[PDB]
């Protein structure tokens, strides 16, 4: 599996009022154990968030309020933007991408995308402003202990995963980037995210996780 180097420069995907959220769900949120979120937590139009405590939110909880409701509209916009992007030099990838390095640009998976063996590296080739957009027609999953790694100055603020169904991250996965799923997102015990978990219509399920926003999350150039 050989990944070519794209020339088309992807623009950032505007997240609007979702930018200061670490986690957003649509139908419900369920947590088990000592999860910690540093960032805001949103739910709309659903009402039920379970498991805080023992989960801890270092941030503001927004349920069916002005900010959460706008954030749902804005994640729909972002999802549709991500899904509609096309470029003559975009790259098709699918299945297990463990062991691969992805350079900047646009990627499309017509089936499920996974990190099943080894780690996936995003390599910005010395340009921190680089953007990486991955379109996924099905699910996004990881086995236990998988990692999203950054090289060449790549930034978690600049990586986007558009997921047309649901995502599931195995125990102790260290994931990065903004995950925008149509349906649900699940993190198993001890998994972590530097990024955002933004579920449009389904649920976010957590167990003993650590969530933080991207380093310098309000910037894409550095």
From TrEMBL:
Top-level taxonomic group: Bacteria
Protein name, per record: Antifreeze protein
Originating organism: uncultured bacterium
